[PDB]
From a paper:
The methylation of U1498 located in the 16S ribosomal RNA of Escherichia coli is an important modification affecting ribosomal activity. [name] methyltransferases methylate specifically this position in a mechanism that requires an S‐adenosyl‐L‐methionine (AdoMet) molecule as cofactor. The protein comprises an N‐terminal PUA domain and a C‐terminal SPOUT domain. The latter is responsible for protein dimerization and cofactor binding.
Here we report the structure of Apo and AdoMet‐bound [name] from [name] at 1.5 and 2.3 Å, respectively. Comparison with similar structures suggests that [name] is an [name]‐like enzyme that can target the equivalent of U1498 in the [name] ribosomal RNA, thereby potentially enhancing ribosomal activity during infection‐mediated effector production. The multiple copies of the enzyme found in both structures reveal a flexible conformation of the bound AdoMet ligand.
Author numbering:
A (entry chain A): 3 to 244
B (entry chain B): 1 to 244
Write the structure that this text describes.
Amino acid sequence: VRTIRIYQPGEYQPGQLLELSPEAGQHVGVVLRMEQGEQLTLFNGDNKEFTASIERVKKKQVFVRIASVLEVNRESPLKIHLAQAISKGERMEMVMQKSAELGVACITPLITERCQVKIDKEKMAKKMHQWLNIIIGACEQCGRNQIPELRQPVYLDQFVREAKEHLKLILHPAFSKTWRDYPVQPPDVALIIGPEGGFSDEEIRLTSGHGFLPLSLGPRVLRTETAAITALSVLQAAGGDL
Amino acid sequence: PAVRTIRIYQPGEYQPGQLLELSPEAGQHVGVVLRMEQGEQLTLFNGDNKEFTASIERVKKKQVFVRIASVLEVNRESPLKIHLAQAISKGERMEMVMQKSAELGVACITPLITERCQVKIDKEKMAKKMHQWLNIIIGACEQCGRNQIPELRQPVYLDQFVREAKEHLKLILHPAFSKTWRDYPVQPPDVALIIGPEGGFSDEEIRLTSGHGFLPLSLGPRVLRTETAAITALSVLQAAGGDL
């Protein structure tokens, strides 16, 4: 039967009593209605799985005893840094969930010329929190024991100037280049996915001038969220662990 | 800056200069949902890889009359014909699979009933789901540029599906003795792909699938949601043997 996986950051060790975070204790004690003696698999984000037993439960307050730890790595050797354009109507929540399932290593929300997002500092902080919770849930579900880094949103110019990945790709139709044209292999790859409206000529000159090379994915127009799934699948199959 | 032309599926054969009253469903979509006005352009397509450049000549309530200006043969189908058999699931996961598999160029889709599916659908509810799923596929072809509609097959149980499958390559997403895409001849003409429910397949089902030549495929060490698995598998298969 399926074990219960719970993300719980910290430096706890076998033998210790641990009080779960309010988020973990809400999940375990309130949502799942778990009781004394039941087993959990905690992971702290460092590719470790901790087997733990529930010692005491009071609503969201859950204390557990750490029994043992095992190194368990389900990360791809190809570390993909996805820069995903934020635009109104495009399903960023799906990208966050599925990119985590597909092993993405780092996610940067991206603001480009043709994105339609209206900037609000308070709205963005709430979205960033919701997206991080979605990523965490996806890691609980899919078995990843490291959480992808979710970086603060940046504009395209900052992203391309600062990218240090060894291969740098952008979903774009120029020259009809495919996976056959690239050596996709570890250590890493940066991937820019733009909004439905694409990139301006000036943005294309900027990305090309910083070493981003275009990647097409077939003759059919993919929704922004489908493009993320498809691009990560293709990259992981080509040079990662699919 | 350029706006992409709205695409609308209308069956039939048409000639330049003809006036077409859109079907009531398409007239509702164009006149009411999209609020399009006289003079605006549309690209109709007929499911047989023809695109009809048209303009709105008259909008009378929800009746939309369009003038066909020109016809162009345009095919955006993959040379690898994938037949996806997707196990039925709770919630609205199937609606997502219908939309995205169409975008990924799937040739044929069969809703699959297997032993470990979480759900049961009565016959009248299944008829409604099949109508809704066809409309999602048509909408996805309008969005993605396919001018041919994937075949949506009637739901069947796993034993019927494996008995009838005649595709040259037959794959099932299952971990036991799995191999990756690199170990299979993913190439035209066609491939049958079984995606089961989250709970997997019984030993007897695997005896049935393997006895009919379905070979086990893996897609990495992380457990994918069923809807993610469908779209990941289609992407990998289209890249390996199709037009990605």
